[PDB]
Design brief:
The PDB classes it as hydrolase. By secondary structure, this protein is of the alpha/beta class. It has helices at about 20-30, 45-50, 50-55, 75-85, 105-125, 145-160, 195-210, and strands spanning about 35-40, 65, 90-95, 130, 165-170. Bound molecules: (1R)-1,2,2-trimethylpropyl (R)-methylphosphinate (GD7).
């Protein structure tokens, strides 16, 4: 099987049970709330909630943020199948995951993303699905930049004839002419600074407004 599309939780090898705690909180969120928009994915999704941009752009939309740092596609898939889509009927689900899929080919990662969209199409058939492209990373040109680009190309091709699945490239051009990414946009060449989130969230918020 494609390991990217075989649903599995993150095994606790540290001992504090943080991953399961987050999942359980999100499950409780879905049990208690009636969101119109559900965001799910990795640290890029999660930290969007920690910015002041969230309360100004996305809170008004009645949204839940189920991002978990370190998640790969198969982890998001497991979470969606194991409680996080229960007791809700969102209009839109936003998916952003795949940059952490180390050891998976771009094709496998694409397969994991397609599996996520399919599951959402089954459990929440009324919802439109928005998939964000994987952002570049690393200070200089490197294999992960090519990988994420290739995933974006493949995912975009997969979603193009899917008329309630929407591929969104939120990258305003973080990779400059000299091939570098500024630490002002990504403080560690992966996570987005407040300045980095600005054009990304603006792009997303715009799309969400059109669909909604
Ligand atoms: P995001 C891209 O999930 O950040 C990850 C790699 C951690 C630093 C492990 C949370």
């Amino acid at each position: 099987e494609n390991p990217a599309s075989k649903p599995t939780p993150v095994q606790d090898v540290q001992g504090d049970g943080r991953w399961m705690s987050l999942h359980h909180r999100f499950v409780a969120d879905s049990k208690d709330k009636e969101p119109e928009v559900v965001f799910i994915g990795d640290s890029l999704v999660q930290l969007m909630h920690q910015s002041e941009i969230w309360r100004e752009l996305f809170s008004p939309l009645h949204a839940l943020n189920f991002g978990i740092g370190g998640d790969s596609t198969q982890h998001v898939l497991w979470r969606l199948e194991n409680g996080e889509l229960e007791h809700i009927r969102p209009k839109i689900v936003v998916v952003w995951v795949g940059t952490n899929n180390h050891g998976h080919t771009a094709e496998q990662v694409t397969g994991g993303i397609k599996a996520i969209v399919q599951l959402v199409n089954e459990r929440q058939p009324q919802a439109r699905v928005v998939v964000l492209g994987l952002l570049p990373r690393g200070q200089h040109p490197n294999p992960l930049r090519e990988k994420n680009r290739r995933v974006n190309e493949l995912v975009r091709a997969a979603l193009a004839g899917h008329p309630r699945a929407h591929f969104l490239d939120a990258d305003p051009g973080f990779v400059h002419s000299d091939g570098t990414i500024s630490h002002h946009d990504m403080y560690d060449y992966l996570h987005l600074s407040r300045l980095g989130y600005t054009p990304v969230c603006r792009a997303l918020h715009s799309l969400l407004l059109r669909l909604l």
